[model samples]
Target chain A: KAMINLHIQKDNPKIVHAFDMEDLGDKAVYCRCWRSKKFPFCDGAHTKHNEETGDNVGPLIIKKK
Target chain B: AMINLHIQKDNPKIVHAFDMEDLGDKAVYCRCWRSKKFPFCDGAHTKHNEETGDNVGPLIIKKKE
Candidate 1:
């Protein structure tokens, strides 16, 4: 099993969700904009945030190795 | 300036924003998803790391002088 970690860079205020391929299952969709109602996962709530703030942020999709 | 923190609620998985100010010079935020304080670190990741063998830490934000 592999380990995954998520963090934010203070200067850029960007999401950095780094993980090994083995850490995930067949596939996974994670949140990036921090507005997801699904917590660590994505539930498409970013669309509203993007529309309101004029920012283009999306989800992080990963597949197994 | 203020910092807006968001966390998820289990019911319907809704997101709520907590606006904060006067955070002093430094703030330690949680990333392990196990903090009782939600966005704030409470050293709960220590036990999480011990149990899962994952090295996850807090997000520390500081005022740059």
Candidate 2:
């Protein structure tokens, strides 16, 4: 935890969006970078952190049923 | 320590793009990893495999220049 800034989405949380995924099992990919002001969405905010300290942060794709 | 990657296009498995503000002049970033969304990222990288503990959290792509 001293040298790694990696954050993995350990669990998926319930969420709702307006994308209207066509039965194609639309999985809503949410940002878990902890840096995104977007919270549930990734606006590519983690790019900086990774470059700063190899801290990788990404989104969790939740399946829509 | 080995991760499975199906690299197509005979290109670099990882690339560098400056489309993000966090990157000023850093090149050779991770943009070739397969994802369901952005070229540099996706949720598939987070899932765990039955043979390894490589929890590829986030796009946490690092620079090696």
Candidate 3:
């Protein structure tokens, strides 16, 4: 359960925010940002999903204490 | 010809460099050294892009001369 910072910069409207990763099965990918669209898996949307396209939210962390 | 100031500040290399000439309107003559985006202030930067949101400070435009 590691945490990460995500900066969603893309052209979509469904992504809630950017930084929201929880678990890459059991380890932290560091830059591995969790995606809400592809649950149970990494959608790799962070590369394209930004704030302007969707919500203008900042960053979010998953599995953080 | 309506030269773009902020969008084409000095540093020689911008698409709108001072004398390069590619302004969207008529050929602008002398410009205001005090204009927001300028060696010549023509109120140009606000049309195609956001306003005040992005300032034209220093050259981050041209790749190289």
Scored by TM-score, the top model is 1
**Residues B1-65, model 3: lDDT tens digits:** 11222333343322122222222222221111224533333554333224323222111111122
CA shift at A34, candidate 1, in angstroms?
A: 12
CAPRI category for model 2? incorrect
Using TM-score as the measure, name the better of candidate 1 and candidate 2: 1
What is the C-alpha lDDT profile of model 2 across B24-52, one tens digit per residue?
33212122233555444445443432123
**Candidate 2 structure quality by residue, lDDT tens digits, A1-65:** 12111233424331222222232244444454445566445667757655654434444443433
Ranking by DockQ: 2, 1, 3
TM-score of each: 0.41, 0.30, 0.16
> Which residue pairs show collisions in model 1?
none
Q: Which digits, one per residue and each the tens of the lDDT, describe model 1 over residues A1-65?
A: 22223233324332323343333456666654555666556789667765665444455444333
Ten residues in a row with the worst lDDT in model 2 chain A? A14-23
- TM-score of model 3's chain A, to 2 decimals? 0.22
Deviation from native of the Cα of residue A6 in model 3, angstroms? 19
Worst 10 residues of 3 chain A by lDDT: A55-64
Off by over 4 Å in 3: A1-25, A28-37, A51-65, B1-65
Which ranges of candidate 1 are over 4 A from the true structure?
A: A1-65, B1-22
Best by lDDT: 1
lDDT assessment of candidate 2: 0.37
